[PDB]
Design a protein around this ligand. Structure first.
Ligand SMILES: [Mg+2]
Lengths: 90, 271, 145, 688, 294, 151, 65, 252, 48
């Protein structure tokens, strides 16, 4: 059985039962919300292509020290920043 | 109040059993309008994770649910026809809602006609209450599992098949007939037979079952994809009860898993 | 007889078959509620010749028409939109103070065109002198002054 | 203001004299009531004069530099979201609102408004102790304008919807790293906690990566012996719980998610993955390597990679840095080779690939490098492009595996056709060619463009759809451009076939229809107004020639915004397409020869008129009242526009290739300069 | 509610699956909240109007707000003579056909809402798939500890689609700037000068000029460039959590992972059902090696 | 020693800017607690608490005085429960758990109210949620306003 | 609350004390030249609900000029 | 859904090209598939065919068409396994390792059925495990081993020489029923030719590479005269590193 | 509960009829009621 003390918890539920009339009860016609994959998409690029790919959108050498986003992590780097990596290595 | 419908409640589970072994589980208008109350009052209950509807049969009846009771319906249709008969008899006796030039005849004609229309109103009520009951089962907010043990006539077919969890035992059966009793089938199963799926898998089956009154069984209801669930276990209802006694929380994560595990271990045929 | 089965397909009237249409879900919920709704509407109104057609075909007691149409100005995404930039999204972004961002961007531009071509020759140099790399912008000092 | 409420105030037009002398035409519509203009259109209720005077007095300040008076401050200040200080949006704030608000704020406390504030202390209040009821909140806007006045929302079409949910179902496909997380990406845990750094967490992995992939001159090696527990996880009950919460964090961060090959979660109840390291062994015996990889590493043999790169590029061939990069990323960190590297390797290794391919039966996989399809992903070719057995392999693991193999030491120039251009450019622009080719593919896939080409060119040949289909496929590659003669009579044939039975060609090819709901007085605009064809309509952006799915939404919106409001510009206007001149027998476009190509302009015409009037169809076309406007318009450019529009919507790729060659001839020589300069760079660097 | 929350969870989950970004619970709920309030607005305005259902002939009339509320009932005295039962059924069926018309209207409205919602999701969704690093493999390709295995069959049947131009980036922003370039080019032309004096022209300027909106008038007063939230390039909720407390980090990443898994399971169920409907799949497992042999 | 705080999803810093303040400022009646409560993934008591704080922060920000009747309006059910409890057990304060009735309801106890709610209908949305739907009898109005001697 | 012609129009709901009976008024001028609000006499009987606390419908019923 | 889709079928995207007829024929084939699956579940014995590490839905690159390899896998080998199961139940050999069946049935005429089937089962297995689809380059250590034996004063002469000796051994087995192995005797390498129904484990060698010289292996592709071409291709597709780790495990 | 995949299919049972879950005739799309999360943080607490 349900204790008298705990019944308040049901209130919001019971509340939006009452309030579900009209548009809130309405679902978009045709659309279930479950969208299955159909095609296969890969936008990956060779490194030399993405070296200057985002220069106009952002600054040049956008992928510079990025290890995950480049196959060559050290390209585009100016000498100093290249030296930094070894500097912390030794 | 009629002891037509009976029930068994565990902590988190609910059993609604239709008891009418005499007329072969054929629901009256009152009994159906009652069932649509017990079903949604069991289903909208706070603690029910699963509400199981089945047939209570003491061994007198192998039906899960009958259709409309055709004896009742036939009876009062006949009465109505007879009253129209007498009313026409006296309408053409004086001719040799009906407005006349004689007060006595207007009196008795209108009494007769009014009573006739009341009878027809009872038949109509029967039909509407069965249809609305089906709808109730279809729209049940919390999970309503219909265990089908034994045969179903038309509106019974409807009642068992449209629950979102509809289980079939070996004994389950579907008879969509009634062009054999001189009427068109009822219970909405017509829809199931007309799905483009059925035309793909079994072209022609729809005409076969709708024209020829013919029984479909568990295997046929599974292949057509009318339901996902089937079991061979004795007294399943007890086990559902005792399983949902051992369950603990009401959070829908928990509920989803408990119900799902129940389904996978028994009602889906993995092994 | 075929014409009789042709007749079966016609929708239910109350003139022929004396029965109202079934529509099921509304009957399921609202069947017991109807007296309530009706008396909330102040009871029915019995009028005369509602659907009764006149001599030449005109409606007697002209029927009630629905005003309903889909409202076309109602997008909420432009009602409550981003507090400073006027964009219509629901996306919460913490921007930077305008004028912080301007100054910031300016000094970056200066610092980078200072490092990459220091001699103003115009071409990008990835091997900059130690003086151009660790060197402070004189524009900062000039701004203080 | 877009709205129902947004109509203006009462404004003067003069006495009867000035009114009759103002209006030329006047058309009346039925009487309806006067809505009072809203508060923001009302000049006396909205006057901002005080605030505008404040803006102007402070206006010279706005022209100077921004300078921090803390010198040495660089980083910008964050302004957070929803703070009242930063809200610039006034939805309904008129002078009226600002004044109601002002007054309420003033009677709240006056001491906020004083230049030198006096002591502000709360006193009693005259409404009662509950006075806040009659006081509180902010001034309220009238509810009529709240509800009704809002702009008309620009209708979203179904096209842009289908695009969005296409993008929605693209992202729901699996990424290869998530189900079983590579040991390489699970070393990356960093916490801000003081107990996390003392124990090097991923140390054995990181050590392995360093030792295998890095030169010993630069590598940092973590030792586990000196680490807190011996670089291990302690035995269970010993560590006071340090070890347990260590394990919890690790098992929680390293767990996989999503669906595996058996279609279920890694944590699913009854069914399991990687039983007894059954996948581990499956990698053991397979290994990740290309056939192409080892053919290359076989032919190259000992000699220097860089030397080879300076060789395989003569001076004008390609940037050495590019194919050096792509080569490195292909050999270790195994990737699909860029079509640059694939072209180079193709003309380098041709005899080894020939020898590898010379024995194979018919129905078995061969080895081929052909980039005719745009994309590089070697799940796309069937793995037959390189020698790869894998769809994808994560770089780190590949590098570790191949380094476990001991091989490397860690410790006429003028006239061109389109094909010539693409195969030349294939070396000097990877991306550009990759784009042209992807686009060509997608255009070849459309049924729509095909049906248009076919049904346009059928009447001219009148014959076999076999020849038309062939000419379609050849048109796709630039190997066919129609002769201007054929073009003109195709256009004519179109006007004829669309007029004789209107049903097919007004339901497929589109003309704009006249609105008799709208009537004004002009000679062009009246033939635009009643019972005529206004414009030749281009294909909707979904069925048209290819555009990428970045921009497809904005492209669509723009097309609709422009068609609806009758803007002629951008994607709606059709570019003038060239054809092959009458005297010239050449089949294609050429880079150098410009006189083979002929444009049909407004001013300079190709004899479209004289060919029309002298055609046998001239009178049956003159029959159509609707075409009468597109034949004869104030702008004699109706025929020119109909023409160019027709051949744009039917044969989009003529303009496509024309622009390709345009761009080539533009940018080629800068590219050769870059190539020679860089190659000679590594050349003198190398011999030195 | 459901159709929305499914798509939003799709977005959140995918956001963490493909890149290491987490969406703030704050954000996730505020999306949904915006959908909700949209519906609410449509309701506010829907109640100002009425829908009229009518039963037999015209002699039973029912006037009801589209939400299904009942305002008036007109009836012929003919009806008054029937029965209480039949009176009830008649009025009830009129009410039903009214609710029908109303519900048709509302469902168009809802389609409209769904479109606005999608349009609002688009900078996020197209934020995650429009990057130079994003990729997918076919769902039928085996996955092993190193990487993903190649699907063998029909080497023609696998086509890799690409959403990004491989040469220098053309972003949606450049397209909008192109659109206003063409707007100005059209306007400032002589033929455009004459067009701006037409009714079409002033309709265009009333709808799509924000710049001319008087101070204090509702709506945006500038034209906005399309939002750019590139997913791998913008740190969202994971960096704040990682700085503050590891525990909330682990919990939120756990939530995202769970949601993603759930979405994927849903997609598998729909796929299975669509496979069964067309008869390529049986109704119980007939192939157990596809499961037990891993 | 103060460094960690539970529930990191909603930070106090981020709730300083109140949500949609540019709307419910201008017609606070069209904005019942529901519309805003869909914004937070928390439980009922917490989100209403937060809404109160939003309103107050907003008010102090705009230099006007806040509605002090607002906490009573959002919590109205809790208000009246506390009033009637105070009259029942004789005490002044807020009722706590120990003093609740020990009645055990059946499982389906809520059915009547459930079908009453599920079948309700409203002319406009204001009628749907007005603040005063909690009150029917005169006793209700006498308990709800006992505080303001004005009302 | 809306504006036209220079003045306010407000919708309100008149009610008995027990809120048994009610009347809506759509557009009412807000005019502060009236010391006290005026209604048509006919409503006096419409709004009278005789509860327990007020045996006659109203607490105060008198005649003024 | 994987469990519900039958064994052969591929699960893909609907292109809506299906006329209702073939759409029904498909469902009928699926029903049949379910029936035959129910009977194969009960026909299942102790031993079973090995799961393939690489996708064979298309052929094995540079070596086999789809039909060739699937005539080895789904025709001859599965028959061998049915035989093996028929004759290892109801005998003292029930439920033991593949080894203890091969080794305890060695050299006896009475159990020749069991032994032949067993050894063929092993050979086919090891053959599948000896094929890496795009081939591989032989690892340094193995090359060093082979060179010390076969190599005469040439660079990886041992590779051309080993892939020669394998060819010669293959051509010198006339019956075209059997196997060719590169194996480790434990004191030296050699290329041995096993007749059908014989195995390297039975002779207590340690196998490195397997090549299938059955005529049924190369018939559909290379015809009856195509054995040389066949072997030459096999080396394009073979798996060396396996042979290497087996060699190194043998040594220690 | 969440870790064991089992029972997660049940959030989505509406998928069992394809032409329906598109049509939205039935208001119950979810396990406990109208949708999967109506009240996630409230309802379940009614169990002692
Ligand atoms: Mg009650």
């Amino acid at each position: 059985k349900v204790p008298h003390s705990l019944i308040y918890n049901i209130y919001p539920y019971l509340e939006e039962i009452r309030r579900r009339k009209g548009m809130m009860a309405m679902h978009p016609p045709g659309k279930d919300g479950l969208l299955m994959p159909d095609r296969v998409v890969d936008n990956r690029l060779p490194d030399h292509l993405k070296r200057g790919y985002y220069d106009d959108v952002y600054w040049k050498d956008f992928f510079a020290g990025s290890d995950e986003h480049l196959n060559e992590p050290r390209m585009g780097l100016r000498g100093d920043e290249m030296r930094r990596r070894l500097e912390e290595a030794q | 109040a009629n002891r037509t419908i009976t029930g068994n409640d565990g902590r988190f589970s609910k059993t609604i059993m239709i008891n009418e072994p005499q007329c072969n589980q054929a629901l009256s208008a009152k009994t159906a309008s009652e069932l649509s109350k017990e079903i949604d009052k069991a289903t909208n209950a706070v603690y029910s994770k699963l509400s199981v509807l089945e047939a209570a049969q003491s061994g007198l009846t192998d039906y899960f649910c009958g259709g409309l009771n055709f004896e009742i319906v036939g009876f009062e249709l006949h009465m109505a026809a007879m009253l129209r008969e007498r009313a026409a008899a006296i309408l053409e006796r004086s001719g040799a809602c009906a407005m006349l030039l004689e007060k006595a005849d207007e009196r008795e004609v209108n009494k007769l006609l009014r009573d006739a229309s009341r009878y027809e109103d009872r038949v109509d009520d029967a039909l509407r209450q069965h249809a609305s009951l089906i709808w109730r089962v279809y729209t049940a907010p919390r999970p309503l599992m219909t265990l089908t043990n034994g045969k179903c006539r038309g509106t019974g077919c409807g009642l068992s098949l449209f629950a979102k969890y509809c289980a079939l035992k070996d004994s389950s059966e579907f008879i969509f007939d009634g062009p054999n009793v001189g009427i068109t089938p009822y219970g909405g199963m017509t829809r199931l037979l007309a799905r483009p799926e059925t035309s793909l898998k079994y072209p022609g089956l729809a005409e076969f079952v709708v024209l020829t009154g013919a029984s479909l069984f568990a295997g046929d209801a599974l292949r057509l994809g009318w339901t996902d669930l089937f079991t061979t276990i004795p007294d399943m209802t007890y086990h559902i009860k005792e399983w949902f006694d051992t369950t603990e929380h009401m959070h829908n994560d928990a509920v989803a898993w408990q119900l799902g595990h129940l389904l996978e271990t028994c009602f889906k045929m993995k092994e | 007889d075929d014409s009789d089965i042709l007749r079966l397909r016609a929708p239910l009237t109350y003139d022929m078959d004396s029965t109202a249409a079934l529509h099921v879900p509304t009957h399921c919920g609202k069947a017991s509620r109807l007296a309530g709704m009706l008396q909330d509407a102040g009871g029915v109104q019995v009028l005369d010749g509602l659907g009764e057609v006149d001599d030449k075909g005109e409606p007697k007691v002209p029927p009630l028409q629905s005003n309903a149409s889909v409202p076309t100005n109602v997008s909420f995404y432009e009602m409550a939109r981003h507090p400073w930039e006027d964009r219509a999204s629901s996306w919460r972004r913490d921007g930077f103070t305008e004028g912080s961002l301007e100054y910031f961007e300016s000094q970056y531009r200066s610092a980078e065109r200072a490092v990459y071509d220091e001699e103003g020759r115009g071409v990008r140099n990835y091997w900059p002198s130690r003086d151009a790399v660790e060197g402070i912008a004189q524009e900062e000092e000039n701004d203080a002054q | 203001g877009g709205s129902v409420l947004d109509r203006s105030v009462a404004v003067p037009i003069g006495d009867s004299t000035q009114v009759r002398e103002l209006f030329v035409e006047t058309k009346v519509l039925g009487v309806e009531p006067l809505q009072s203009p809203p508060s923001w259109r009302t000049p006396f209720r909205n006057d901002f004069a005080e605030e505008r005077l404040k803006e102007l007095q402070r206006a010279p300040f706005k022209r100077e530099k921004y300078v921090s008076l803390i010198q040495g401050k660089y980083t910008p200040k964050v302004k957070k979201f929803g703070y009242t200080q930063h809200t610039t949006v006034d939805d309904f704030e008129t002078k009226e609102y600002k004044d109601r608000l002002l007054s309420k704020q003033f009677f709240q406390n006056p001491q906020a408004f004083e230049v030198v504030p006096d002591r502000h202390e709360r006193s009693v209040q005259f409404g009662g102790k509950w006075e806040y009821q009659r006081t509180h909140g902010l001034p309220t806007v009238d509810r009529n304008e709240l509800e009704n006045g809002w702009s008309e929302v620009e209708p979203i079409s179904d096209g842009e919807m289908k695009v969005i949910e296409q993008a929605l179902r693209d992202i729901s496909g699996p990424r290869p790293g998530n189900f079983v997380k590579p040991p390489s990406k699970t070393k990356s845990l960093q916490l801000s906690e003081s107990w996390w750094e003392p124990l090097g967490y991923g140390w054995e992995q990181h050590n392995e990566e360093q030792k295998a992939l890095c030169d010993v001159t630069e590598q940092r090696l973590i030792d586990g012996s000196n680490l807190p527990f011996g670089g291990k996880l302690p035995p269970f009950g010993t560590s006071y719980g340090m070890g347990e919460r260590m394990r919890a964090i690790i098992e929680d961060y390293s767990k996989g998610f999503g669906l595996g090959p058996h279609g279920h979660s890694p944590t699913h109840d009854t069914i399991h993955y990687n039983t007894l390291n059954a996948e581990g062994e499956r990698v053991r015996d397979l290994g990740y390597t290309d056939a192409l990889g080892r053919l290359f590493s076989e032919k190259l043999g000992d000699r220097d990679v860089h030397q080879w790169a300076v060789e395989s590029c003569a001076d004008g061939e390609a940037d050495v840095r590019q194919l050096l990069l792509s080569l490195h990323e292909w050999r270790e960190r195994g990737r699909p080779p860029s079509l640059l590297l694939a072209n180079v390797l193709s003309k380098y290794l041709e005899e080894e690939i020939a020898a590898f391919n010379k024995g194979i039966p018919e129905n078995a996989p061969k080895l081929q490098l052909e980039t005719s399809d745009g994309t590089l992903a070697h799940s796309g070719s069937g793995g037959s492009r390189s020698g790869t057995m894998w769809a994808d392999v994560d770089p780190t693991t590949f590098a570790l595996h191949q380094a476990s193999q001991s091989t490397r030491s860690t410790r006429q120039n003028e006239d061109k056709m389109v094909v010539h251009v693409l195969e030349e450019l294939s070396l000097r622009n990877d991306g550009l060619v990759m784009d042209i080719q992807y686009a060509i593919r997608e255009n070849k896939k459309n049924r729509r463009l095909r049906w248009e080409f076919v049904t346009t060119l059928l009447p001219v040949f009148g014959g076999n759809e076999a020849k038309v289909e062939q000419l379609y496929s050849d048109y796709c590659d630039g190997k066919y451009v129609p002769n201007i003669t054929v073009a003109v009579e195709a256009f004519i044939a179109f006007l004829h076939n669309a007029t004789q039975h209107p049903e097919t060609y007004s339901a497929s090819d589109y003309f704009d229809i006249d609105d008799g709901k709208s009537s004004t007085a002009s000679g062009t605009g009246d033939q635009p107004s009643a019972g005529q064809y206004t414009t030749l309509k281009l294909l909707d952006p979904l069925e048209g020639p290819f555009v990428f799915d970045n921009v497809k939404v904005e492209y669509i919106q723009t097309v609709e915004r422009f068609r609806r409001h009758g803007i002629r510009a951008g994607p709606v206007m059709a570019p003038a397409t060239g054809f092959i001149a009458a005297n010239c027998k050449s089949l294609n476009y050429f880079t150098r020869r410009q006189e083979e190509v002929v444009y049909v302009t407004n001013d300079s015409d190709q004899g479209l008129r004289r060919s029309l009037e002298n055609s046998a169809y001239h009178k049956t076309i003159a029959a159509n009242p609707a075409l009468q406007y597109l034949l004869k318009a104030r702008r004699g450019a109706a025929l020119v526009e109909t023409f160019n529009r027709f051949f744009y919507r039917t044969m989009p790729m003529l303009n496509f290739y024309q622009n390709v060659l345009k761009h080539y001839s533009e940018t080629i020589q800068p590219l050769r300069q870059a190539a020679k300069s860089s190659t000679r760079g590594l050349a003198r660097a190398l011999e030195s | 509610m459901e159709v929305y929350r499914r798509i939003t969870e799709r977005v959140r989950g995918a956001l963490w699956a493909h890149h290491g970004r987490l969406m703030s619970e704050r954000q996730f709920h505020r999306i949904l909240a915006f959908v909700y309030n949209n519906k609410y607005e449509y309701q506010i305005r829907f109640d100002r109007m009425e829908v009229v259902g009518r039963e037999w002939g015209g002699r039973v009339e029912v006037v009801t707000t589209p939400a299904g509320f009942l305002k008036r009932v007109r009836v012929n005295p003919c009806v008054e003579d029937l029965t209480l039962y039949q009176q009830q059924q008649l009025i009830l069926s009129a009410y039903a056909n009214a609710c029908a018309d109303g519900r048709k209207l509302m469902e168009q409205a809802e389609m409209n809402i769904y479109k606005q919602f999608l349009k609002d999701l688009k900078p996020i969704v197209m934020g995650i798939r429009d990057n130079p690093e994003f990729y997918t493999v076919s769902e039928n390709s085996i996955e092993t500890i190193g990487g993903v295995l190649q699907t063998g069959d029909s080497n023609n049947l696998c086509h890799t689609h690409r959403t990004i131009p491989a040469a220098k980036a053309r972003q949606p922003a450049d397209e909008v700037r192109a659109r206003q370039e063409w707007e100005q080019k059209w306007i400032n032309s002589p033929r455009g000068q004459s067009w701006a004096l037409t009714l079409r022209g002033k309709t265009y300027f009333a709808l799509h000029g924000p710049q001319y909106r008087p101070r204090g008038a509702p709506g945006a007063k500038k034209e906005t460039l399309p939002l750019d939230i590139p997913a791998p390039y913008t740190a969202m909720d994971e960096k704040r959590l990682l700085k503050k407390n590891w525990m909330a980090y682990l919990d939120n990443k756990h939530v995202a992972e769970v949601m993603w898994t759930r979405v994927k399971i849903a997609d598998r169920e729909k796929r299975q059902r669509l496979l069964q409907e067309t008869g390529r799949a049986w109704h119980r497992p007939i192939n157990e090696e596809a499961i037990n042999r891993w | 020693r103060l460094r960690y705080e539970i529930n990191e999803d909603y930070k106090v810093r981020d709730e300083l800017g109140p949500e949609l303040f540019a709307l419910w400022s201008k017609a606070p009646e069209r904005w019942p607690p529901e519309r805003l409560s869909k914004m937070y993934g928390l439980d009922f008591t917490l989100v209403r608490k937060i809404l109160v704080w939003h309103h107050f922060k907003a008010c102090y920000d705009a230099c006007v005085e806040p509605d002090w009747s607002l906490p009573k309006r959002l919590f109205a059910l809790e208000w009246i429960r506390d009033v009637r409890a105070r009259k029942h057990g004789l005490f002044y304060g807020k009722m706590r758990f120990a003093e609740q009735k020990i009645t055990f309801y059946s499982d389906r106890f809520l059915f009547r109210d459930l079908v009453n709610r599920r079948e309700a209908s409203y002319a406009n949305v204001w009628e749907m949620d007005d603040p005063y739907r909690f009150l029917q009898t005169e006793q209700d109005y006498e308990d709800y306003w006992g505080d303001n001697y004005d009302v | 609350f809306r504006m036209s012609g220079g003045d306010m129009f407000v919708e309100y709901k008149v009610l008995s004390r027990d809120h048994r009976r009610s009347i809506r008024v759509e557009d009412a001028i807000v005019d502060p030249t009236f010391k006290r609000t005026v209604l048509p006499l006919g409503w006096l009987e419409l709004l009278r609900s005789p509860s327990l606390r007020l045996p006659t419908g109203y607490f105060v019923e008198e005649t003024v000029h | 859904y994987h469990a519900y889709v039958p064994k052969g079928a591929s699960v893909q995207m609907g292109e809506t090209f299906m006329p209702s007829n073939i759409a029904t024929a498909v469902f009928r084939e699926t029903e049949a598939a379910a029936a035959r699956a129910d009977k194969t579940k009960e026909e299942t014995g102790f031993f079973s065919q090995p799961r393939l590490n690489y996708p064979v839905s298309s052929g094995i690159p540079a070596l086999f068409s789809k039909d060739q390899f699937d005539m080895q896998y789904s025709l001859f080998h599965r028959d061998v396994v049915e035989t093996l199961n028929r004759h290892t139940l109801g005998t003292p050999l029930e439920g033991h390792n593949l080894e203890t069946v091969i080794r305890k049935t060695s050299f006896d005429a009475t159990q020749a059925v069991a032994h032949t089937a067993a050894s063929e089962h092993f050979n086919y297995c090891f053959f599948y495990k000896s094929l890496r689809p795009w081939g591989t380059a032989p690892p340094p250590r193995l090359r060093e081993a082979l060179q010390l034996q076969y190599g005469t004063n040439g660079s990886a002469d041992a590779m051309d020489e080993v892939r020669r000796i394998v060819w010669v051994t293959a051509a010198s087995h006339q019956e075209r029923c059997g196997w060719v192995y590169l194996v480790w005797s434990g004191v030296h390498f050699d290329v041995v030719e096993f007749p059908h129904g014989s195995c390297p484990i039975a002779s207590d060698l340690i196998p490195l590479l397997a090549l299938n010289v059955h005529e049924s292996a190369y018939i559909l592709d290379y015809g009856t005269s195509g054995l040389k071409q066949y072997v030459e291709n096999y080396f394009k597709a073979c798996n060396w590193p396996l042979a290497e780790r087996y060699y190194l495990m043998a040594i220690g | 509960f969440v870790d064991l995949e089992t029972g997660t299919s049940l959030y989505f049972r509406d998928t069992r009829d394809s032409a329906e879950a598109i049509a939205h005739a039935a208001d119950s799309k979810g396990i406990k009621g109208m949708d999967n999360a109506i009240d996630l943080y409230n309802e379940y607490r009614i169990v002692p």
